[PDB]
Design a binder for these strands. Structure first.
Lengths: 104, 303, 73
DNA sequence: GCTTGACAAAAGTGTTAAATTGTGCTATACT
């Protein structure tokens, strides 16, 4: 009565292994020690890091050091406290609190 | 409902008085400073005396415990706000839990020097956290936040205009208030529509569900599937009727041999002749094939 | 055993719609200017119209007329 | 049967103007 379709379409072509795309396999290792293989085309430009099956961004074995992939550092609770308190004020706070514990 | 366990467990800690909040915040700040001192001074040695070391570690632990206590006593606030936004699409207890994540941020930013209550500041953070949570997670097909806000604005305007006019407005009437074209609001309304459940029963009984009777448009039609292959043979038989000299150019031009079309120049990589000559050969073969002597063989495959 | 005629069947849905309208009106009369409100400005007729539309559309009793022949109808 | 000169249409290459998306923060008080 009503019709719809999947997110894709079908192709009727027939050919089989008689056509070969030149490919080579890269090797990756993850944090936990698992290893994985990924077939790439001979155009290569293989990436230094790959997201493997287990979900760990593993690194290639051929290179001694992969692409740095450097990223900015995180923002933490002290680093945001320092945006509202001066170190001079924190020194006085520490002195004031040390006075009470020193009382006993 | 089984949210009662959370309500009970948070009910074992009493509310803070106005003077305890400042004490807790100041303790948290002092403990943070003590931890940062112990972290920093290690980079250059600078041994502290054992008594001072133990006192400073106690300060650190007291600050951490005061932060935990401040979160504990204020967990009760989040539920009073979460109960307002329940029913919009996300679960009540999920609302509470992710508003708690704005509550930790509120505790992180709250300070006493402003001379204001903890609730006054924490309410804003809890509310924005709940709003963001609902915006991101309330729909099966995710809608970015700004799109959710414009959809909400359209809904708000449409409700009032319907209350006034007494009927659903035409798109231009809503456009006159949105300051955007009528087709724009018509597209927003399309973006707003939710998917239906594929498992809903159909037929007024439990005989079957809706999904059991959806006809697939992109099906593998049998007669076509075979038919194409026949053409892929018949065409070959026509191309095989030519000399290999002529056939190779067409087979390379349209990529029949390997599936990749080739420019006029690239065909010369094996044939040697110039691109213009390859074009002339292509024209000769192309005119020979279209002659009725070979057209009728495969004309009616086009449909 | 009694017989709900068409009138009572329609009346039940009218009552439901007016009950929803009553809930809305009693909720909203607490939050409007007193002595300046007007009855036509707070009576909301949407729920009753929605109930009437739902009854004639989806109710199991409101069936398609059987026009096979005069006797069938 | 084919090369060469010369030309225009189509399409890659890169910049960037515009559109879209993600994110932190709003301090009367409210538990």
């Amino acid at each position: 009565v009503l019709r719809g379709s999947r997110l894709g379409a079908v192709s009727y072509e027939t050919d089989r292994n008689h056509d070969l795309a030149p490919r080579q396999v890269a090797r990756y290792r993850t944090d936990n020690g698992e290893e994985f293989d990924v077939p790439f085309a001979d155009d290569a430009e293989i990436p230094g890091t790959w997201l493997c099956r287990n979900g760990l961004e593993g690194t290639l074995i051929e290179g001694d050091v992969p692409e740095p992939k450097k990223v900015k550092p995180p923002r933490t609770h002290w680093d945001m406290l320092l945006e509202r308190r001066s170190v001079e004020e924190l020194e006085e706070l520490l002195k004031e609190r040390l006075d009470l514990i020193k009382a006993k | 409902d089984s949210v009662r366990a959370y309500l009970k467990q948070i009910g074992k800690v009493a509310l803070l008085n106005a003077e305890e909040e400042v004490e807790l915040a100041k303790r948290i700040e002092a403990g943070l400073y003590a931890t940062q001192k112990l972290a920093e001074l290690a980079e250059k040695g600078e041994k502290l005396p054992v008594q001072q070391r133990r006192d400073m570690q106690w300060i650190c632990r007291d600050g951490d415990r005061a932060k935990n206590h401040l979160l504990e006593a204020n967990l009760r606030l989040v539920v009073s706000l979460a109960k307002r936004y329940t029913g919009r699409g996300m679960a009540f207890l999920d609302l509470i839990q992710e508003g708690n994540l704005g509550l930790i941020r509120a505790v992180e930013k709250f300070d006493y020097t402003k001379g204001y209550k903890f609730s006054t500041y924490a309410t804003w953070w809890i509310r924005q956290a709940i709003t963001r949570a609902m915006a991101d997670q309330a729909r099966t097909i995710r809608i970015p936040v700004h799109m959710v806000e414009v959809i909400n604005k359209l809904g708000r305007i449409q409700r009032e205009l319907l209350q006034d006019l007494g009927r659903e407005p035409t798109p231009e009437e809503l456009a006159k208030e949105m300051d955007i074209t009528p087709e724009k609001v018509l597209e927003i309304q399309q973006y707003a529509r939710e998917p239906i459940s594929l498992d809903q029963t159909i037929g007024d009984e439990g005989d079957s569900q809706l999904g059991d009777f959806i006809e697939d448009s992109e099906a593998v039609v049998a007669v076509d599937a075979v038919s194409f292959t026949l053409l892929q043979d018949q065409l070959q038989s026509v191309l095989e009727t030519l000399s290999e000299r002529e056939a190779g150019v067409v087979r390379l031009r349209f990529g029949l041999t390997d599936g990749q079309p080739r420019t006029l120049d690239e065909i010369g990589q094996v044939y040697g002749v110039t691109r213009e000559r390859i074009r002339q050969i292509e024209s000769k073969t192309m005119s020979k094939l279209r002659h009725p002597s070979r057209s009728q063989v495969l004309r009616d495959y086009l449909d | 055993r009694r017989l709900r005629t068409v009138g009572e069947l329609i009346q039940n849905q009218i009552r439901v719609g007016l009950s929803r309208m009553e809930r809305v009106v009693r909720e909203r009369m607490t939050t409007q200017d007193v002595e300046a409100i007007t009855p036509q400005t707070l009576i909301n007729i949407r729920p009753v119209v929605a109930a009437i539309k739902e009854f004639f559309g989806t109710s199991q009793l409101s069936q398609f007329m059987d026009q096979n022949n005069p006797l069938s109808g």
